């Protein structure tokens, strides 16, 4: 009985492969050959944020692209001011182990989660001027990998167990669950329109979910190892995925297959974080070889290198405005990079 | 303007207060000691926690030294992703049942993965080999477990340096030292990093495991400091 099901699944997979091969008409690298190279990208560190006293796993930028919140294993959640280097808030966490944080689009709430298997939400705007846990979200079985505010009232959380959930803060109960993954759901990135989001798991595959209905639409099995980072292209019709192969790969939703690979021979370490520039021409990608890299998103030529971190680069962010690029690391230092002419 | 000056002054005052709090908490953070109690299945973790929803904490302090013991309870079996979270701890208390399938081989394959992880290679490991009595009656009962689950037990002799048992069975002490030697050969095969292993034989349920942990942590800290001063 199971043999028939396995044969059917195999022949659907073969049909999908044949359809993708037939749809494969040209190559983005071939098309982009006749375009002017980006050139040398010189960016120097403008600010160093040196308040944390333990390694940083997460940072996030505000919508205004001025405030950034950073989390560390020492049970602190410090909210910086990038321009003046001052610290605005410092929230002592109940659990020392937090692997993620998220700054709400409204600027009112901040999320945080980790090995406690719960997501804590702090409302920064209080009458007494003190930050306190507004809500505790429990129901995930494994650790909490990533959490992104889809709104001020609903947050998507990707947990260690093979399950993503869409919550509702005003009531605290899950609204929709996203089952179908096989391994740890390491990362998660929302679409620009908050209509879709991709989740990169540890089974070397990525899915595309729609929050309103709640089922996967497409799958992208291009990689060959754990997927640690994921990021939508600014168009909202493509995304890049970092894995432990040291290769970023640009996928396309409409084409439903890869576009072009960002591998390099000199790179052996795994990819930890991935982000795009505002225009989508650049592709910053933090590595485990202590150095962040800048790629030409259309030609896969290394434009520049963001060397300067003592330990591995765990988190990488590009401002919504697009000016600066913050890179946290495991040496407990945040650095705000920028370019000058 | 004057308003922006007032805003900047308020921001500097808030920064000063937050920095004061951070400095005050830094001493506590640097004073406390973090341990990750990582047992390979049901090997005595319950009784070890007795004598001293995702993760657990047991704040026990000994000789004005504060200790954190983290027990990973509700996490999945997939350990390769959240174990990088614990490369800043001082030591990894590892618990092995020395008695479904062969548990000792699973313990060894977890131990060498922990040893050879590129982020955990700077972290020391402390071994507790529980179920000493269980191994004792298993050996005395003529049960074919070790002599056929490890073919190399036949050509093994108890080392001449260590024999502290008062009246225990020589076969039992040979089994104990064989298991300890297996873990020690795993530990000593690779000297890639700057970490050490402290194997212990947890037999009595008395308040001696806490003393062993305290002495091991003292040794770990002393080695780390002497290495940082390039003396060791």
């Amino acid at each position: 009985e199971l043999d028939q099901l396995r044969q059917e699944a195999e022949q659907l997979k073969n049909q999908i492969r044949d359809a993708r091969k037939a749809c494969a008409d040209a190559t983005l690298s071939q098309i982009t050959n006749n375009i002017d190279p980006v050139g040398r990208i010189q960016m120097r560190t403008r600010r160093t944020l040196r308040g944390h006293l333990a390694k940083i796993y997460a940072m996030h930028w505000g919508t205004d692209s001025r405030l950034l919140v950073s989390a560390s294993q020492d049970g602190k959640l410090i909210i910086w001011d990038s321009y003046t280097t001052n610290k605005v808030h410092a929230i002592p966490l109940r659990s020392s182990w937090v692997m993620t944080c998220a700054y709400a689009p409204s600027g009112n709430y901040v999320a945080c989660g980790g090995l406690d298997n719960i997501c804590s939400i702090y409302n920064l705007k209080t009458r007494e001027g003190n930050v306190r846990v507004s809500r505790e979200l429990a129901g995930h079985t494994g650790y909490l990998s990533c959490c992104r505010f889809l709104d001020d009232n609903q947050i998507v959380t990707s947990s260690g167990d093979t399950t993503c959930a869409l919550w509702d803060i005003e009531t605290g109960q899950q609204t929709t669950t996203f089952t179908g993954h096989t391994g740890d759901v390491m990362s998660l990135s929302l679409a620009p329109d908050t209509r879709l989001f991709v989740s990169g798991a540890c089974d070397a595959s990525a899915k595309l979910w729609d929050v309103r209905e709640g089922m996967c639409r497409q799958t992208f099995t291009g990689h060959e190892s754990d997927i640690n980072a994921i990021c939508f292209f600014p168009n909202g019709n493509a995304f890049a995925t970092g894995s432990d192969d040291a290769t970023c790969r640009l996928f396309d939703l409409r084409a439903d297959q890869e576009l072009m690979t960002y591998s390099h021979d000199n790179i052996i370490c795994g990819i930890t974080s991935v982000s795009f520039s505002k225009s989508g021409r650049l592709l910053l990608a933090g590595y485990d070889d202590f150095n962040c890299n800048v790629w030409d998103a259309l030609k896969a030529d290394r434009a520049g290198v963001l060397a300067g971190h003592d330990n591995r680069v765990s988190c990488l962010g590009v401002t919504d405005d697009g000016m600066a690029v913050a890179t946290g690391s495991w040496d407990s230092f945040l650095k705000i990079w920028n370019g000058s002419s | 303007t004057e308003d922006q000056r007032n805003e900047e002054k308020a921001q500097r005052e808030a920064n000063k207060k937050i920095e004061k709090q951070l400095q005050k908490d830094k001493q506590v953070y640097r004073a406390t000691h973090r341990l990750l109690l990582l047992g390979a299945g049901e090997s005595g973790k319950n009784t070890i926690v007795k004598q001293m929803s995702g993760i657990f904490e047991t704040k026990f302090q000994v000789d004005k030294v504060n200790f954190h013991m983290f027990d990973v309870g509700a996490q999945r079996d997939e350990r390769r992703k959240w174990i990088q979270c614990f490369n800043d701890v001082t030591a990894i208390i590892f618990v092995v049942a020395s008695s479904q399938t062969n548990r000792l081989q699973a313990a060894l394959k977890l131990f060498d993965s922990i040893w050879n992880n590129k982020w955990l290679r700077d972290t020391s490991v402390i071994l507790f080999l529980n179920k000493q009595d269980l191994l004792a009656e298993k050996v005395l009962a003529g049960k074919s477990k070790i002599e056929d689950y490890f073919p190399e037990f036949a050509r093994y002799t108890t080392p001449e340096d260590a024999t502290p048992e008062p009246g225990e069975d020589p076969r039992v002490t040979r089994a104990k030292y064989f298991i300890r030697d297996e873990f020690l050969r795993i530990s000593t095969a690779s000297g890639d990093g700057r970490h050490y292993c402290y194997p212990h034989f947890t037999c009595a349920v008395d308040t001696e495991n806490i003393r062993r942990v305290f002495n091991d942590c003292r040794d770990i800290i002393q080695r780390m400091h002497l290495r940082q001063y390039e003396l060791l």
Epitope: E224, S225, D226, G270 | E78, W115
Partner: nanobody, 127 residues
Framework: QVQLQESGGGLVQPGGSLRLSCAAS????????MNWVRQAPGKGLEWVSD????????SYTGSVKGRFTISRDNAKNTLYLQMNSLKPEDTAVYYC?????????????????????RGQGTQVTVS
Amino acid sequence: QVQLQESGGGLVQPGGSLRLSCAASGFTFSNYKMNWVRQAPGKGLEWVSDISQSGASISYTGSVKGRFTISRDNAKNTLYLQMNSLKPEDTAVYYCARCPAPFTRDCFDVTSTTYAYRGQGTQVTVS
């Protein structure tokens, strides 16, 4: 994507011979440490063997040393297990797992109920 599919297996008298092969068609074979895993009908998963990136460091689970031989061929992207002198205790389901990351001598989660980079079953019985 990885698509690890194994061959061989079946019925054999005790003390007989059998050969198991592993087919990998989704990654670079020469970068990953490939290891075999077997699961008894009633017991849990049990690590049985392994082999290094090049084929230098080889280890066995005990009670199978000598009678089991593991070798890899990077040219054809195939992993082998030459297994000899079987006993009824060898009856199990054999899986061809793969360590999650390349160029690492350590790989954590191979003997787990829900691994992602291991193949399907390969029935082996002895009677």
